[PDB]
Structure 1
Amino acid sequence: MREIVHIQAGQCGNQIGAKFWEVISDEHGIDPTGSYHGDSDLQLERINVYYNEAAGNKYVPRAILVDLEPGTMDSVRSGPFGQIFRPDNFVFGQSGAGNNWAKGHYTEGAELVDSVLDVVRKESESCDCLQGFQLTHSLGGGTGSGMGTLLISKIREEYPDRIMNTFSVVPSPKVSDTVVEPYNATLSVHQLVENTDETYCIDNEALYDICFRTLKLTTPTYGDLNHLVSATMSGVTTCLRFPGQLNADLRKLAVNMVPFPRLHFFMPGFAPLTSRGSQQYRALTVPELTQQMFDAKNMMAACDPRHGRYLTVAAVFRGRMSMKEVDEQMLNVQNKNSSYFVEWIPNNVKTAVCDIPPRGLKMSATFIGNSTAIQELFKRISEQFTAMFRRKAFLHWYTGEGMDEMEFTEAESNMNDLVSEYQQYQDATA
């Protein structure tokens, strides 16, 4: 009734994208066949935000699956919720993008993009009132990063008055040794600053450190990293999918979260942090959730929030608990750390409560923060980029696909401009 079209791109995009559909499909009681078997009408009231209905009261994700190689899409197709996705919404090439932004954005990806738009268009046309698009992808490879940003540009051309949202996985050398990731990610960030409204920065640095240091997993796998992504995605989309007042559509979230059009990069956090499988036996009290969701160690972006100031925050508490105690605790964090919240945006913290908890938990909290400390993320990428770029290293892979050095220089500059704007507001004062 206010529909969202979801797109997932590349290996990473499709991996987390699949996990997201598994998790939410279960929260809304949909099963692999696409049949509702839940026991609550809360589950269905806003089901049309993410699912189309079908013959036999069937629910079908409004989800387009994109990759330049077939590999992962056969892994999607024959995973648990593989059957649920609409088969003509699988759009795949044959060659792959070889971790190369330029191929995904300018050569190999441009061949495929028209067919993805045809599928987007067919999905946009059956929509009573389309709100926008959410894209899942990594920024360190070639398809999700290069082709993903190409798509975004093209969708905004056809739907310039719809909201664009991404969950963008930021690369880290603690997780990948592919040497051109900083290039691919600086080029993507350039696109993102210009053409999205909200971006969830999901930093592989942070997910790895959480797995290792806090969940005591000595050999984290992508499965462990993605469990954290899917929990966060479940949490940050709760207000869109369940009945509610605050940030209940993409536009309203954006208005609440983005004071300046370029500063739309969000830090998500989650409490309690869990590892897959192992159960959690104690429920958290509302104070523990509050203290934890705001903890640096619970952030999915590896930035220290005490190094910045929060422009805006949204908090979402899930489960059966006292709204009185939540308001009190929410108020106590701000009044006890008020200097970390910009005083020139009054009442910048907003709080929602959904009665349905996530599977496996009695109580949970998701935090979405637009903080100036995210600049640490962009500096880090920028340092890694510069170390290579100043010797023009690895550039032949990009110039061989038509690109000029100028395009790298513009991108580095735009990301350095972004970083300094965060700084500007960090320092501001009334």
Structure 2
Amino acid sequence: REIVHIQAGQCGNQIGAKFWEVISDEHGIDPTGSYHGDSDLQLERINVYYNEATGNKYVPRAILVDLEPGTMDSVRSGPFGQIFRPDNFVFGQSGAGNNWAKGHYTEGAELVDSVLDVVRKESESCDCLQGFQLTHSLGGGTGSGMGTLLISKIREEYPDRIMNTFSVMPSPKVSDTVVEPYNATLSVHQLVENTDETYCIDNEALYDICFRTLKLTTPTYGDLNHLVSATMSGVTTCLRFPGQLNADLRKLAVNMVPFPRLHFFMPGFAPLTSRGSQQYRALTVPELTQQMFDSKNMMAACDPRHGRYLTVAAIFRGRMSMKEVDEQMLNVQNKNSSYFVEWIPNNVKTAVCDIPPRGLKMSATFIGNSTAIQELFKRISEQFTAMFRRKAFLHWYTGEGMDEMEFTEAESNMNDLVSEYQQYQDA
């Protein structure tokens, strides 16, 4: 069951590269593409993400996309820059100017067919393609605008495949431009309709974690991407290593998505660590379970106590007592049963994987579908409305052919999504 990976825009390519860097190390693949590991667990399902090449070389099934060559040139000169298939580098020259319209309708529409040629070339090599995963931000132009354009066209050509995304949400605390709420709202509209699974990665939460918890006075994007790569590794563990639970993208979707539009997940992770800062003390299982559920460990700036969990997927990594894990997992549900919907019996599922990530002897990754996620979309909607009520900064969009009505629809659909999440919070 092969997965085709796509990374779009500056953010998309910067976390996308970091992702391939991290899991390549876990699968024992060096920058050359050669395997140098000591466990056979590493190679059993390496076909999910890697293509097998001459000399038993492994090549990521990854497609790199951008409307400017800057970031992708940095990727190609980065640590694992050479592992990527050079033909899978598809880039324009004009950029998107943090403009959704440019990415979706003009600049990106010019490039999108070239990208789909590569997607198609990769897909036909697959014995049994299960689907796609996209990494991108929603606050810019390329990843947000062209990324959702790609999603729409992939769904057209592969309507029976799963679409998955890692979507970075914009935050004023970590902001490039004022129009990020516009770009994000337009994108969420697209995501609600055309993805089955979306990991909501909030730059607000990533900032707060770095500041409040990791005590980083002034966090960079590099710091923020330490958390993202750690989270991305964890939520894909069940897909990359042998196991019985949530092993493919469809079975994850069937277990996590009770209603088709409500497919926006809160990722969580424990223990939280900063770059370089060495951890010497391994956490106990009770500690991992408590932390991975705490709001301070959520990658989406939402209070889980303000909502209810529809579904939960948990993945413990390392050498530990699987009996202690099940005990602690059952304790959380039994002590805080109110925060789990009673009309989905046994909605918490747990997996365990012997291989821990690098630098930690054990870890836990959390994937929650909570109604509390509405707080994320409400926040975006408020920032959106503040500007839109005065039609501020809209000329950037009307200049590319967009009409005000399209903003109104996007606004309305996100507010509908909010109310849908609220409907089940009071069930």
**Cα deviation 1:267-289 (Å, max 9, x = unaligned):** 00000001011110000000000
**Cα deviation 1:187-206 (Å, max 9, x = unaligned):** 00000000000000000000
Helix, strand or coil: the match of 2:110? helix
Residue 354 of structure 1 aligns with which residue? Answer: 353
Distance, in Å, in 2 between the alignment partners of 1:292 and 1:65 is 34
Residue 189 of structure 2 aligns with which residue? Answer: 190
> CA shift at 1:61, angstroms?
0.1
**Cα deviation 1:222-280 (Å, max 9, x = unaligned):** 11000000000000000000000100000000000000000000000000001011110
Residue 87 of structure 2 aligns with which residue? Answer: 88
Residue 276 of structure 2 aligns with which residue? Answer: 277
**Cα deviation 1:105-140 (Å, max 9, x = unaligned):** 000000000000000000000000000000000000
1:200 aligns with 2:199: yes
> CA shift at 1:421, angstroms?
0.1
TM-score (norm 1): 0.99
1:48 aligns with 2:47: yes
Distance, in Å, in 2 between the alignment partners of 1:126 and 1:175 is 40
Distance, in Å, in 2 between the alignment partners of 1:15 and 1:295 is 28
Distance, in Å, in 1 between the alignment partners of 2:304 and 2:54 is 49
Aligned sequence identity (%): 99
Distance, in Å, in 1 between the alignment partners of 2:299 and 2:16 is 17
Distance, in Å, in 1 between the alignment partners of 2:232 and 2:83 is 19
Distance, in Å, in 1 between the alignment partners of 2:277 and 2:283 is 16
**Cα deviation 1:374-397 (Å, max 9, x = unaligned):** 000000000000000001111111
Counterpart mapping for 1:97-246 below 5 A:
97-246=96-245
Distance, in Å, in 1 between the alignment partners of 2:390 and 2:219 is 34
Structure 1 residues without counterparts, runs of 5 or longer: none
Helix, strand or coil: the match of 1:360? coil
**Cα deviation 1:84-105 (Å, max 9, x = unaligned):** 0000000000000000000000
Helix, strand or coil: the match of 1:83? coil
> CA shift at 1:177, angstroms?
4.5
Distance, in Å, in 1 between the alignment partners of 2:295 and 2:128 is 38
Distance, in Å, in 1 between the alignment partners of 2:21 and 2:391 is 43
**Cα deviation 1:50-93 (Å, max 9, x = unaligned):** 00000000000000000000000100000000000000000000
**Cα deviation 1:14-42 (Å, max 9, x = unaligned):** 00000000000000000000000000100
Distance, in Å, in 2 between the alignment partners of 1:237 and 1:137 is 17
Distance, in Å, in 2 between the alignment partners of 1:178 and 1:37 is 44
Figure out how many residues of one structure are paired with residues of the other and give that number. Answer: 427
Distance, in Å, in 2 between the alignment partners of 1:70 and 1:351 is 41
Helix, strand or coil: the match of 2:108? helix
**Cα deviation 1:265-314 (Å, max 9, x = unaligned):** 00000000010111100000000000000000000000000000000000
Distance, in Å, in 1 between the alignment partners of 2:245 and 2:316 is 12
**Cα deviation 1:151-170 (Å, max 9, x = unaligned):** 00000000000000000000
1:317 aligns with 2:326: no
Structure 2 residues without counterparts, runs of 5 or longer: none
Helix, strand or coil: the match of 1:301? coil
**Cα deviation 1:297-351 (Å, max 9, x = unaligned):** 0000000000000000000000000000000000000000000000000000000
Distance, in Å, in 2 between the alignment partners of 1:396 and 1:219 is 34
Helix, strand or coil: the match of 1:418? helix
